[PDB]
Amino acid sequence: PQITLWKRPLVTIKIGGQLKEALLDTGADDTVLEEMNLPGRWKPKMIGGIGGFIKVRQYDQILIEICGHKAIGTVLVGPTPVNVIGRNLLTQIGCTLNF
Amino acid sequence: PQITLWKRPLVTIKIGGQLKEALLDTGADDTVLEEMNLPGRWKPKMIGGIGGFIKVRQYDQILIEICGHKAIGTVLVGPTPVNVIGRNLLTQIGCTLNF
Numbered sequence: 431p432q433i434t435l436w437k438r439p440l441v442t443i444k445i446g447g448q449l450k451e452a453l454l455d456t457g458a459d460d461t462v463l464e465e466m467n468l469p470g471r472w473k474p475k476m477i478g479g480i481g482g483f484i485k486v487r488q489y490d491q492i493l494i495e496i497c498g499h500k501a502i503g504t505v506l507v508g509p510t511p512v513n514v515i516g517r518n519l520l521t522q523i524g525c526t527l528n529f
Numbered sequence: 530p531q532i533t534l535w536k537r538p539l540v541t542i543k544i545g546g547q548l549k550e551a552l553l554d555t556g557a558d559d560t561v562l563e564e565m566n567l568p569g570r571w572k573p574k575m576i577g578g579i580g581g582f583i584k585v586r587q588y589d590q591i592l593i594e595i596c597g598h599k600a601i602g603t604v605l606v607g608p609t610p611v612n613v614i615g616r617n618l619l620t621q622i623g624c625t626l627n628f
């Protein structure tokens with residue numbers, strides 16, 4: 431799709447068999463989701479945003495479908511204010527900025 | 530133009546007679562720029578993201594040029610670690626997400 435930006439670019443995602451809403455965030459290097467249950471192993475990781483650093487659970491090679499487009503990559507899980515899809519997965523679904 | 534997301538979508542902007550580097554950020558409602566002593570009136574604001582909140586100064590009707598595209602709108606100035614062009618200005622230069 432072509433998505434204008436008068437509203438937040440929110441889309442439905444499928445991860446671990448569960449549907450969720452997430453923000454397409456070109457300013458995020460990484461994909462960070464709010465606390466949830468995800469199967470498999472994970473590693474403690476630190477990520478920094480506008481207000482400082484937080485602890486997250488890093489899940490590697492996770493299947494995630496974004497607006498009908500499949501991706502397989504790293505998903506960070508922790509106290510982010512909102513679910514964000516970052517560039518690590520935006521590149522997989524072929525997302526570009528255009529103006 | 531078309532900007533891929535392999536790397537951060539950094540562009541040159543002109544604001545307050547100065548050139549800066551900023552991210553084209555679809556995850557930011559509004560624009561947030563590094564500390565700069567802009568002239569005119571402002572109102573305090575608190576904005577939150579990963580890690581918590583920072584204090585910023587809200588300036589209204591500020592002229593910004595983004596890759597030669599002129600825009601005018603709200604700019605939040607404060608100790609942000611990165612300059613981000615948000616949707617309030619991305620809409621004005623005709624920026625869309627496409628996949």
Ligand SMILES: CCC(CC)CN(C[C@@H](O)[C@H](Cc1ccccc1)NC(=O)O[C@H]1CO[C@H]2OCC[C@H]21)S(=O)(=O)c1ccc2c(c1)CC[C@@H]2O
Nearest residue numbers: 457458459460478479480556557558559576577578579611
């Ligand atoms: C709310 C969703 C989102 C935060 C998840 C909102 N952010 C925008 C998002 O793109 C930030 C931009 C950024 C900030 C610092 C350093 C680099 C990039 N990226 C982000 O945190 O990415 C994380 C995960 O990947 C990693 O890569 C980069 C950093 C790590 S914001 O900056 O905090 C913001 C902006 C305007 C405004 C607000 C909040 C409130 C009102 C105002 O309009």
